[PDB]
Design a binder for this molecule. Sequence first.
Ligand SMILES: O=C(O)[C@@](O)(COP(=O)(O)O)[C@H](O)[C@H](O)COP(=O)(O)O
Ligand SMILES: O=C(O)[C@@](O)(COP(=O)(O)O)[C@H](O)[C@H](O)COP(=O)(O)O
Ligand SMILES: O=C(O)[C@@](O)(COP(=O)(O)O)[C@H](O)[C@H](O)COP(=O)(O)O
Ligand SMILES: [Mg+2]
Ligand SMILES: [Mg+2]
Ligand SMILES: [Mg+2]
Lengths: 448, 91, 450, 448
Amino acid sequence: YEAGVRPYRETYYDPDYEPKDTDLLCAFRITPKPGVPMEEAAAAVAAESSTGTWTEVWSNLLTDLERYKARCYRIEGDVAYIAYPLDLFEEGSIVNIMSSIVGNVFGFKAVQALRLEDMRIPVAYLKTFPGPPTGIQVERDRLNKYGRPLLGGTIKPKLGLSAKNYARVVYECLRGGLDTTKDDENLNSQPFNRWRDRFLYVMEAVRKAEAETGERKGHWLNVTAGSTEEMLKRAEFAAELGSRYIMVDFLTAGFAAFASVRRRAEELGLMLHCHRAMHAVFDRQPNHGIHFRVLAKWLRMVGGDHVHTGTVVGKLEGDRAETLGIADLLREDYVPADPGRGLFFDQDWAGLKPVFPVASGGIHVWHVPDLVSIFGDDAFFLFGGGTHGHPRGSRAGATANRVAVEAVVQARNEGRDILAEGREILEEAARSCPELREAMELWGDVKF
Amino acid sequence: LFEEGSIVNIMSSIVGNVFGFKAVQALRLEDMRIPVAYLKTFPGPPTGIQVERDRLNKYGRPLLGGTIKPKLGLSAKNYARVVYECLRGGL
Amino acid sequence: YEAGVRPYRETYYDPDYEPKDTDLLCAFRITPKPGVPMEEAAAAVAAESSTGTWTEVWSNLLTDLERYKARCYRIEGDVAYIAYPLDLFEEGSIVNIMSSIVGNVFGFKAVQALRLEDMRIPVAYLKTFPGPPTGIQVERDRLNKYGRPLLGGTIKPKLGLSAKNYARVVYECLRGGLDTTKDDENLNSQPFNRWRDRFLYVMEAVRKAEAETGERKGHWLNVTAGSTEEMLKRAEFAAELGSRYIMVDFLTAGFAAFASVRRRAEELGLMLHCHRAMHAVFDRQPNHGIHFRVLAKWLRMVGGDHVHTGTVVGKLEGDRAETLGIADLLREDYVPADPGRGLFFDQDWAGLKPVFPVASGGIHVWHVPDLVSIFGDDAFFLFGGGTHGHPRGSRAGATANRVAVEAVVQARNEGRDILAEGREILEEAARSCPELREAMELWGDVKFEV
Amino acid sequence: YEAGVRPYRETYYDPDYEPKDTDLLCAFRITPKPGVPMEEAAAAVAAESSTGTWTEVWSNLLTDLERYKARCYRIEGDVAYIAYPLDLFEEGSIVNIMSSIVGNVFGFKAVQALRLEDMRIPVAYLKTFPGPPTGIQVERDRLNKYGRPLLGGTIKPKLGLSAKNYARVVYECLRGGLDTTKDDENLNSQPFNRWRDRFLYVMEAVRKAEAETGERKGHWLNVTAGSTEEMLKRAEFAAELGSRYIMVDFLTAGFAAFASVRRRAEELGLMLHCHRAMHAVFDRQPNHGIHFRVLAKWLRMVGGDHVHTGTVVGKLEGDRAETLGIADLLREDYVPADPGRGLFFDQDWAGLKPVFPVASGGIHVWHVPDLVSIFGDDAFFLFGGGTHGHPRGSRAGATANRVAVEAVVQARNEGRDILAEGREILEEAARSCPELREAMELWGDVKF
Ligand SMILES: O=C(O)[C@@](O)(COP(=O)(O)O)[C@H](O)[C@H](O)COP(=O)(O)O
Ligand SMILES: O=C(O)[C@@](O)(COP(=O)(O)O)[C@H](O)[C@H](O)COP(=O)(O)O
Ligand SMILES: O=C(O)[C@@](O)(COP(=O)(O)O)[C@H](O)[C@H](O)COP(=O)(O)O
Ligand SMILES: [Mg+2]
Ligand SMILES: [Mg+2]
Ligand SMILES: [Mg+2]
């Protein structure tokens, strides 16, 4: 035992290390404090997210640090690759992953900025997680909807509507062609609209629209609440009322409560929509934070049936290439590494069910060719303002959006170039659909 | 606009989506004034500083603690041996 | 520390204090013992309802009495205004409010009579209460009834009917046009009519009436009982049978058990009717007690869907101007002070749901013009004797009262002065409704003062 | 069936009726509206508290009103006696008694003022009530205290003390000679003193004083709360901490919740102190309300172990003769009617256990001779201000009060007249008790 402070790289930088198939790997983009070499910064991140601290400790001799320490094994420019032994992690706990990988290392004086770009989850650790309870294929069977993207939309105004008026908007949307509707992420239980009231009114509107159209419908009832117990109570009630879906803000509620709700959702027969409120607080900036592709891996592991992924073309930020990679991570059994899409590692999903991507935010009929081109059939397209903002209201707006999606789907199956011929496809459909003609006219000038 | 007693609801509105808009390149929430009428729907700490000092019977100084190291890798038995030495020594 | 007895006035009278928006305020009408000045009596009430006792105590120095004491901050004649800091009260407990405000101060030798006239509940404290489970607007959607007062009535005789005969009366009333019917406040479970039998027979009567009229119907099944556990058991059974409503005597059962029943009603999806039995024991006399407007505020805070407010014109006492104020306290988002109605403070309701006023007691068809003029549309009018006492029985009586209310409402919406033209509006309807004509003939000479 | 309004007197006034042993009887003092004969006003009370309403109903023919109606069978000046058949009441429910007897009859225009003076509870109905769970004799055995009144006191200031300072006052009081101490009626759980903290701090003080004095001690922890469930939760916690007592405001909490708390108390082995907060809102005025002796009967039926009865000589109102009757009602097996004490009926108690009277409110050492003379040994005397207001604090004050009571009990047992020689008895004890001397000097001029 030699007391005193030693540089982190002496023990935690090992560019000769060859990662094992059981290791958990991380890709960190590091911005060191000026004067701190890149190797010392990367080693500090590895040390203080595994086994080390700022000075040597006599208790190091009571353990086999060679077995348990993480190691930065490769540095490519400002990107550091770090490997973590399988034994460092608690089985089935995303919370534990976060507490090591992003626990303290983002606040060190020696590392000015730090962003976790990707993470390789090893198969041996994935087997301790359940994944989604329903999955794309079973959900299409439960809805009896095949061969196209599914239609949805957030009820607006976000807040302020009574339960009665809120449910009237739901009825109008579903009656007009939307497959689903949803509560806004911030609509929980408030003085103007208490959750029990909303749940009762809405399911009556869902049943009515379902009877009148002859198509199956659902509404994503938000159970997000201040405690795990209250969320479970709201899920139990939605199931009692015969709802197909519930909704949870998995990041604001948090991963521990999220896991509790996901377990209860499967026991009640509910499908689980996951809203990513708060994600942009730490996945927006390229120099610091956690990229959403990491959050999307954690989401699939705990087990959401959908998660929002961005629209690329809408009102919220999202890169086309990164979004395409995120969609594969959510839907495929195996995703090869792809630098062109920001995927730093191959990801085997070990038989876990796939998650529905969900595109929402500032989109309207003119975006439908782009969206089909980006996502294909296996996705939800959500039209909030794009439905209720129609000159003739939600019902007319729902019809315009549903017809647009089916026109572009039919064109693709016929082999046409849906981007090169996008407007032509929408104009042919508008000739037999007055509601689509009016939507194209109102928003023809709205671009982001 | 807010659900009584729910921090989760506050976050869902205030930091829900507004950090990812194309029109706003960066955004930082600096402070927040919680009104008294809303605070009263929250319980606050279960113990509190004064009751805790009574339970510890320690007054008139900062209190001493420390994180067991190495972070990970110690057996349960060796972990508790480190604990004992620290507490026996004055922490 | 200086031991010994000091006048309450020295510490608990502060005419310079400016109430805070978080303070709870009371208006007391005080009748001091002769020889005791008003200021000393008012300070005694403030002292012994907050922090003080009859002599100085060394332990006053272990706390900041400046922060917690109540203060009488204004006196006008025999009215005393007292302010209580927000931190003196337990969140969400009417029981605690009463324990301080009306706990011991009504029994002091130095204060010969005491009446609490009004109370200002601050917004910061209201937010700790849930309010009504359903509320007027949700309830109208659950019933599918709009644009008129709702019709009800107590089943008579109060006691003695078998469960089977009890339900037969219910059926006749609902079949004849009443929207609801109710158990008498004193009908709980008795040898001549046990609660399980009554609930079963009655719900069968309600379903038959709904099917024959094509209108939604309800009955207010009284779950009042000797213990909280028994009341909850009876509520569970009412929900199992599909009842839309339950009923509780919130004062005789008490506020603690009332809170328990209100919570379970929301969980069960039941609407909660509240009967104010016992209120007159302490809200009647002008010199001593608690004015009903305070009880109504507490009622809305705990959360009842309806509460009886009186009729003004019926067999039970009630003042018109005071009732108008009470009706606003139950239904409106904000009620400004109004000395003419006895509203001593502005009352903000902080988004709590509203409560249905219920007018009941010794009323009949001739009172309908006055009832509509007083309450408007958002109210229940209950006719017990006024229904079963009809010459041809309950079904005919229910038809007569229903038609009367719909005619007075129509005439009002047509712009007529229903008070100046009340008799004419009723006589016009009678020409097309034999039941109403005969009800008007029977009770035309039955009047109560006002 | 003859429709129309009839005078209440025709059916509900019967001066030839003989009350049965199974009838519940009431004595009402009635102030009719000017112009309403006394017989009509009494008939109206009988009718609208049993079976009648304001007009004849066809459904009367479906019922045997002769079997079930109440009847005014006697009028003596402005006092009306009314008999109610046993079958009108629900077994074991004070709530049902109130809903009939005092439900609506106090608010009729025809009766300008109404006061219920006394009530004869028949033995056949009493057998459906459990009565106190402990009782005076069992309680004295649990405390191991005999041959004197018991000492208590409310902690002061009423509100504002932290839990720590609160338990310090408790410790001084018990260490000084008080048998018990109690929370104020309005101390429940508040931001300055939460109930969990208070229960923990106080029980530590109780055990500490118990060990230093060698006598058994107790504190009346207030479980009064806004809902039945919360009160039961607090009672469970008191029992878990090994408390001998809990306390409930049985009127502000309400009788239904009171019954719930009484049942749980017996199951938990707790003795139940009952505070009568709010009683003066309806029992103070002689023209309108309910006399406390009625509430005292209902209290013993549900089963409180103590209840406050007033001091007569203190700061709160109370008539001596009426107080002597109320104590007999609470303690004796059978109480015969007595016009000099306001007892309108004989009351058989059917074997129910007796209740401890509790005298409290503005009393000090000079009142002890009167209190012993009034109540005898089986009572609590509570000194709040009379303890903490001592020139030298709570321990000194508790000593002065304990010494005074034992000096007076000692003089009585020797055959001295404790009232004629009260001053001499206290002065003799003060010669050897400086704490008593200082209390006598401090409060010698304080009289009510
Ligand atoms: O709150 C909103 O703005 C939305 O309801 C969109 O409403 P419109 O349909 O009216 O735009 C969605 O929650 C966002 O799209 C979420 O963003 P993301 O999908 O990127 O998490
Ligand atoms: O018991 C009764 O007398 C009633 O059923 C009325 O019967 P009628 O309809 O036959 O008069 C009601 O409970 C009273 O109106 C309550 O008084 P309030 O509404 O003033 O609390
Ligand atoms: O709050 C109070 O005033 C007391 O704590 C007395 O304190 P002191 O001992 O300082 O007077 C008691 O609650 C009253 O005696 C109750 O009145 P009753 O016994 O008549 O119900
Ligand atoms: Mg949204
Ligand atoms: Mg009634
Ligand atoms: Mg007290």
